[PDB]
Structures are given as structure tokens and as C-alpha cells.
Amino acid sequence: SLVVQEQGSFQHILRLLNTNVDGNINVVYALTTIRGVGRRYANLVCKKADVDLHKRAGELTQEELERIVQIMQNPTHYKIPAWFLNRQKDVNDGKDYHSLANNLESKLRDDLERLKKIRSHRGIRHFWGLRVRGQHTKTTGRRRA
């Protein structure tokens, strides 16, 4: 049922993928805190890592953290399907990457300025900071900042 928790071993604050996470959250939802990581993704990564689903973010060992991160950064070797990824294909090089937090903003931005340079309607609209997906704007949003 319950265990003595092994005082002196439960982590409190962890720094994974140069991002800080709190150890008291369940491992899956804790890993979701990292950008570019959703609940489904974190769950599949965690179960591929053999690390238990019902664990806490402060109770896993360091080698488990290393296993989890190497899984999360190189999915294709670990029978994570060619789909399921954050940026499948990567319209620059054709190899299915999965961007993580800081790389995620860097790449999303660089795509935004690629669209600005491409000077497409998508690009010009993103530059204008309006609704780019072709939605109605006659009565929507009306207020951001």
C-alpha cells in the first residue's frame, strides 16, 4: 500500500532540459511542464522508460532521469512511431525531429520569420498579429494588449 518514503531521497526541485520542475507532481504531468511536451507524449515517454506511471517527480533515480531525457530527445530509436512527434519531417531537412522547449521557441520563431520573408498571406498576417487561420475577425478578439 504505502512505503516509508525513504526520507533523505525524495527530490523537491529538479532541473531537466534546463527547465525547473517540482518533484511533488506525478511524473507524467510533471514532465508535461516542459514546453513541447504534452500529457500524451510524456505518458508514452514515461512508459517507454519503464519508470512507473504512479511515481512522483521526486522519487525517481538519476539514471531514470537520464533514460527519460534520452528517450524524449531521440524518439525514433525507441520505437516511438514516425508520427506522434512535435514537428514531423521538419520542412528543412525531412527527418522527423521532436522539438523541446527552448529549441521549440527558437524553431517556431524562425518559421514565423521564414513566413514573413516568404511574404505569404500567412506570413504577412503573422507579422500583423491577427488571426492567421482565416477566421472571422469582424467580431472576434477585439482586445489583446
Partner 1 sequence: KTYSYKGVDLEKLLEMPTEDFVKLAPARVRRKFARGLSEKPAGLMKKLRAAKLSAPENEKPAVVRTHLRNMIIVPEMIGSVVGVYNGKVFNQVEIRPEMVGHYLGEFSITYTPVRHG
Partner 2 sequence: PGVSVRDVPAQDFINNYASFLQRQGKLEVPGYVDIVKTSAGNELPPQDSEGWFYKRAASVARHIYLRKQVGVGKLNKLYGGAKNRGVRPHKHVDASGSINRKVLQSLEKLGVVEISPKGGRRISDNGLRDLDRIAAATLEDEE
Partner 3 sequence: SKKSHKDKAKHAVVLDQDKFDRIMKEAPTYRYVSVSVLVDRFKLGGSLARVALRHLENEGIIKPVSKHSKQAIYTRAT
Residues 6+ apart with CB under 8 A from 52: 27
Q: Is residue 143 at the binding interface for partner 3, with CB under 8 A as the rule?
A: no
Q: Is 79 annotated as a binding residue?
A: no
Pick the closer one to partner 3 by CB: 30 or 49: 30
Q: How far is the CB of 74 from partner 2 (least distance, A)?
A: 17
Pick the closer one to RNA by CB: 63 or 117: 117
Instruction: Give CA–CA dist 138/19, Å, rounded.
Output: 40
Q: Strands 13-16 and 19-22: what pairing?
A: antiparallel
Q: What is the DSSP letter of 63?
A: H
Q: How far is the CB of 43 from partner 1 (least distance, A)?
A: 27
Stretch that binds partner 3, among 5-13, 42-50, 91-99, 117-125 (CB under 8 A): 5-13
Q: Is residue 126 at the binding interface for RNA, with CB under 7 A as the rule?
A: yes
Instruction: Give CA–CA dist 124/115, Å, rounded.
Output: 8
Instruction: Give CA–CA dist 137/121, Å, rounded.
Output: 15
Count residues contacting partner 1 (CB under 8 A)? 15
- Amino acid occupying residue 87: R
Count residues contacting partner 3 (CB under 8 A)? 11
CA torsion, ordered 69, 101, 41, 123, to nearest 10 deg: -150
Instruction: Give CA–CA dist 41/57, Å, rounded.
Output: 16
> Residue 95 binds which entry of partner 1, RNA, partner 3, none, with Cβ cut-offs from 5 to 8 Å by kind?
partner 1
Q: Is residue 114 at the binding interface for partner 1, with CB under 8 A as the rule?
A: yes
Pick the closer one to RNA by CB: 65 or 85: 85
- Known binding site for Mg(2+): residues? 138
- Known binding site: residues? 138
